[model samples]
Target: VKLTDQQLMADLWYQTAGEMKALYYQGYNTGQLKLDAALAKGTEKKPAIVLDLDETVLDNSPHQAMSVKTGKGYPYKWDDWINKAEAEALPGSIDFLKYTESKGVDIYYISNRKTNQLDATIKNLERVGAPQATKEHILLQDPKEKGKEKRRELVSQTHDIVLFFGDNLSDFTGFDGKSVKDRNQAVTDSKAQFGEKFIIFPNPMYGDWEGALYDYNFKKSDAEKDKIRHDNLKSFD
Candidate 1:
């Protein structure tokens, strides 16, 4: 279950890099500008901002660091970390969270964490002093239903979602399970939305982009997966 050197580097950057913190600050700084613009428009519907939890608002690198240190992959003490309810808010994220509250823009957290751990999730968010950490605003994924679009629709029914935030494409759209080619094309097609309406945070750690590398085959051996990862690299040589 030991992660590869490359995988280790990803976790290291996420865990130890000041640059990573700066990137998060950059994302939230841009988010403030976009959020203000959205609020300035003056919608009939109540303005709302949708955000994904894990790497978007909360810093979960400690969980990834656990995996790296223990030589174990996901689901290994993952619940323990979640249940501890100690994940810190990302850099500059709290400022934006409070700003949204000040501007009267409702914040809805749409995350794929299991519904069974909803209480822990809420506790962790609240511990970080995040606004709107209640059940009404936090939507955890049910076992049978994982896509966030449905939860997003529920938010849309009550409030106009002026901006969306996530580290994963699925958090912002239905790009899940799409091939790398299709995912890139979709981003190209919606180029105007990035930073304007979709405030994306950086996640070099595990994500759907990693799954797309091996054609979404999760059961592949480490050797096979490593080959695919290397194959994807471009070289002038």
Candidate 2:
């Protein structure tokens, strides 16, 4: 039986934030190296760090938990939850972002958040004391758009994006249509850039990683989804 809650261990969530802090500082120092270069390049273009929403910077597990209780998915009354705008910031989000700006760096948020809820999204970020919550900084995905690519390009137009942070591999540019195996392979191929140019947080709650196992078919029944997940498990059996 599926429980009406997202299975999360409090200790791990807190611990994950602690580890994320360490990596963030490491990336910050690296970003600092490029700051001199970005500054030398021009004033019209700013040096910025790109980040994603949902699991990347916001704690939306409660929304997921509500889904579990309601037995819903995408058609899961998400509009109401987002319009409510009560999500808490992830452990290190505010602190890390604050420091990033102290170095005169810009923070651009690029995510698949529904464009319609953009107002509430901005409000929620401010309630949590999040940096760069302004409309200019946040790049939301509209229903009519083709994913986050164009929004990212919009940020790239005026900012020298030094680092990208996200939970899904697709958060990295040019990664949307790739399969799970290929995604993992891409990680292997970019080991050198993992911690520096790319900073990732732990997010097993939900993302493309879960759906990729099911071939991006959202209409699959619960049993079919469970079967695919089970078959993909790497085990000693």
Candidate 3:
């Protein structure tokens, strides 16, 4: 059985934030070195960092739990998830982001959040004391792209994009249609980039990558879905 979101949060709250902060600092320092190398080669732009919001910057497990318990999925509407504005800051996120800003690095949030909820999202970030939480720096999902290609376009504008942080693979690579094997191959191809240009957080609740494995169809019976989930796990095994 799936654990309740609240239960998951309660269990993970103590260590999640601290661990994420450590990873962020590690990524940031590593990125600085990459940036220096790029600059030595005459890269004019400063290094920028891209972050995902839900699990990376804020803990929305409560909302997810509410959805699971109620038999409704989150983000039923953009307004409810984004505009309701009740998400709590993820552990260690605020301090790490602030520290990055203090070092003069640009921090950009590339979230899968819908555009309609932009205002509420920004408000939530500001409330949590994240640096550069403005709308200009918060790139939301575009209808044209499944994940967040818009943010990649935005990041390309003025920054070298030294680091990308998120809890999902799609956060680093575009959601191009690829089979499971292809996706794994792609990850392997980018192996050297992990921990240096990419830092991933842990999020087991929900993400499109899982849905993609099932062809994005959740209409199956719980038992059927459970079987599918199990089969996928075994495939990994």
Backbone clash total for model 3 is 1
- lDDT score, residue 145, model 3? 68
Residue 66 CA displacement from its true place in model 3, Å: 1.4
Clashing pairs in 3: 17-91
Between prediction 2 and prediction 3, the one with superior lDDT is 2
Candidate 3, 1-237: lDDT as tens digits: 442333455435433557655665555555556545544564468767788888778777766656656655555543666666878876566766776687677889998777877888889988888899788898888766666765687687888776777777888865455667777788888888787667767666777666766677767665666667667765532
Q: What is the lDDT of residue 21 in candidate 1?
A: 91
Please report the candidate that would top lDDT against the real structure.
Answer: 1
Runs with alpha carbons beyond 4 Å of true place in candidate 3: 1-42, 76-78, 218-223, 235-237
lDDT of each: 0.87, 0.73, 0.70
Off by over 4 Å in 2: 1-44
Error of 3 at 200 (Å): 0.8
Task: State the lDDT of candidate 2 residue by residue for 71-181, as single tens digits.
Answer: 665548777878888988775667778877888888889988877778999999999988878888888888877667787788888887877888787787766767889
Ranking by TM-score: 1, 2, 3
lDDT of 1 by residue, 1-237 (tens): 245356788888887899989989988999999888877878889999999999999888888877777767776898999999999898999999999899888999999999899999989988989998899999999998957889999999989999899999988876877898999899999899889889888898888888888787788887787778888989788
Better of 1 and 2 by TM-score: 1
